[PDB]
Design a protein around this ligand. Structure first.
Ligand SMILES: O[C@@H]1[C@@H](O)[C@H](O)OC[C@H]1O
Ligand SMILES: O[C@@H]1[C@@H](O)[C@H](O)OC[C@H]1O
Length: 377
């Protein structure tokens, strides 16, 4: 039985020997540094009395990924003021009110809120929806736009039914119940598959969609079994509906193990912790940890999914270490305990490239301390 059923969350820092007091203080200090820390560390920026944004420091823009991530961190840390500032920014600047992307979020904008491209990123929408559901269950709905439950249901309605509103496209392929890379293209991104959120969407979404969301959960668990390499546990950034690496795209080669794919190990580990439904998840977690067991974080490269290293370094090696450590929620192999310790002894990244590493870092600090939880009712 998973944490969803028992209400009990594994505290791997505690199982590993760290003191309860040290752990809570470490989690609180990670929060403080990321949202209120110095100019070289923080990724959160207040705007006026009622807005705020998560900065992709590397790309000097605001992404629906980072906004939705900041809202999830805020609600897991019971930080309503920051949650509300981030949501208000997303609601005000990013969410489309009309046209083919109505109720979707523009995937990126300038920090001042000027939209840069209208197209959405589905991993944004699914985190917004999950964070808003948790906000409703934790704090209760307020007047619009802080009517969190209805806001979540509106996003997930468009996610399944955009094709019916007019000229747009849904973010899930109805034929196979799989999340797409973008609404228009017939392939996926394995790091976007969050079967554990789809279980909760099957409880909290519009009644007419609950059957679909339950099928989506089972379809996504099956899909990650097809996308992950059976020796190395590595996955491609973009994958076909059959799990094989998708073709090279006009904007680059996403066939290999790089930044997006790091989140797969994290996502499978949290589904195991919450729902304990697919025991392949334990072996997948053991495999990826075995793959990285004897590789220094400063040596992390881009890899083919069969594990052939490129000369090129990982752009986000702290992010990769974080997802590898988060796999300890599921792994029972000889490497779980050492990745937990390696992570504990790793500080937040600083400087221009810090955004992505520090997002993945925080989700791991939450998870390994037993604080990445389902908020029900
Ligand atoms: O996770 C996606 C990421 O790869 C992209 O660069 O920006 C945010 C999302 O579209
Ligand atoms: O937004 C992310 C970007 O900041 C990172 O550098 O590459 C992966 C993207 O998802």
């Amino acid at each position: 039985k998973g944490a969803y059923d028992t209400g009990t969350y594994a505290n791997l820092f505690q199982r590993s020997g760290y003191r309860e007091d040290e752990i809570k203080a470490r989690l609180e200090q990670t929060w403080n540094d990321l949202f209120y820390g110095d100019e070289h560390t923080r990724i959160y920026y207040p705007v006026g009395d009622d807005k705020g944004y998560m900065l992709d420091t590397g790309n000097d823009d605001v992404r629906s990924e980072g906004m939705s991530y900041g809202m999830m961190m805020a609600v897991q840390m019971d930080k309503k003021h920051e949650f509300d500032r981030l949501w208000n920014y997303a609601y005000t600047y990013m969410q489309h009110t009309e046209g083919r992307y109505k109720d979707y979020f523009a995937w990126h904008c300038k920090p001042d809120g000027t939209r840069l491209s209208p197209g959405p990123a589905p991993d944004g929408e699914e985190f917004f929806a999950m964070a808003l559901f948790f906000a409703s269950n934790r704090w209760g709905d307020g007047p619009a736009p802080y009517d969190y439950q209805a806001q979540a249901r509106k996003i997930l309605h468009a996610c399944l039914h955009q094709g019916e509103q007019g000229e747009g496209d849904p973010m899930w392929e109805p034929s196979n119940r799989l999340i797409k890379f973008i609404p228009e293209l017939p392939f996926s991104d394995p790091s976007y598959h969050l079967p554990h959120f789809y279980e909760l969407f099957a409880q909290y979404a519009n009644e007419q969609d609950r059957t679909f969301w339950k099928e989506a959960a089972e379809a996504s668990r099956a899909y990650l079994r097809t996308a992950c390499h059976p020796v190395t546990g590595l996955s491609p950034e973009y994958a076909n509906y059959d799990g094989t690496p998708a073709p090279v795209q006009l904007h680059g080669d996403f066939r290999h193990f790089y930044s997006d794919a790091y989140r797969v190990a994290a996502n499978v580990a949290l589904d195991w912790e919450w729902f304990r439904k697919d025991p392949w998840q334990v072996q997948q977690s053991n495999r990826i940890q075995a793959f990285f067991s004897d590789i220094d974080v400063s040596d992390y490269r881009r890899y083919t999914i069969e594990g052939e290293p490129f000369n090129e370094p990982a752009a986000h090696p702290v992010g990769l270490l974080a997802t590898n450590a988060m796999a300890s929620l599921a792994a029972d192999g000889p490497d779980a305990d050492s990745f937990v310790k390696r992570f504990w002894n790793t500080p937040l990244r600083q400087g221009k490239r810090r955004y992505y590493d520090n997002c993945l870092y925080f989700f791991t600090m939450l998870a390994l301390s037993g604080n990445y939880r389902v908020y029900q009712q």
